[PDB]
């Protein structure tokens, strides 16, 4: 999987 | 966030 | 370039 | 893998 | 949105 | 091109 940095607010890492 | 269209098969829209 | 669908709120297309 | 919609012109789905 | 790291060279963080 | 950070385990930068 890959890590993405997106704002969910707050900016966090997300594993896809 | 961003909508990604990924296959896990089923092609799923992911809320990332 | 590629089109991404992300919320900027509102969800829109974005050309990268 | 994920489907990207990109052009280089025709827009196509790229399998990544 | 998501932060993408793309090269246009200079590698730029993009607010998408 | 964009740099993705992905693992399949070592995490590496993938050039897309
Ligand atoms: Cl994993
Ligand atoms: Cl273009
Ligand atoms: Na990961
Ligand atoms: Na485009």
Experimental method: X-ray
Resolution in Å, one decimal place: 2.3
The DSSP letter of residue D2 is B
In angstroms, rounded to a whole number, what is the distance separating the alpha carbons of residues F10 and A7?
Answer: 25
Residue numbers in D near C1 (CB within 8 A): 6-7
SS3 content of chain E, % helix, strand, coil (to 5): 0, 70, 30
A14: nearest CA partner in chain E: E2
Nearest to A2, CA basis, from F6, F16, D1, B13: F6
Q: B10-16, long-range: CB within 8 Å, 24+ apart, which pairs?
A: B11/D3, B14/A16, B16/A4, B16/A6, B16/A14, B16/A16, B16/E2
Backbone CA torsion sign across D16, E6, E7, E8:
positive
Please name the chains neighbouring C, where neighbouring means 3+ C-beta pairs under 8 angstroms: B, D, E
SS3 category, A3? strand
């Amino acid at each position: 999987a890959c890590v993405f940095f997106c704002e969910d607010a707050a900016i966090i890492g997300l594993a896809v």
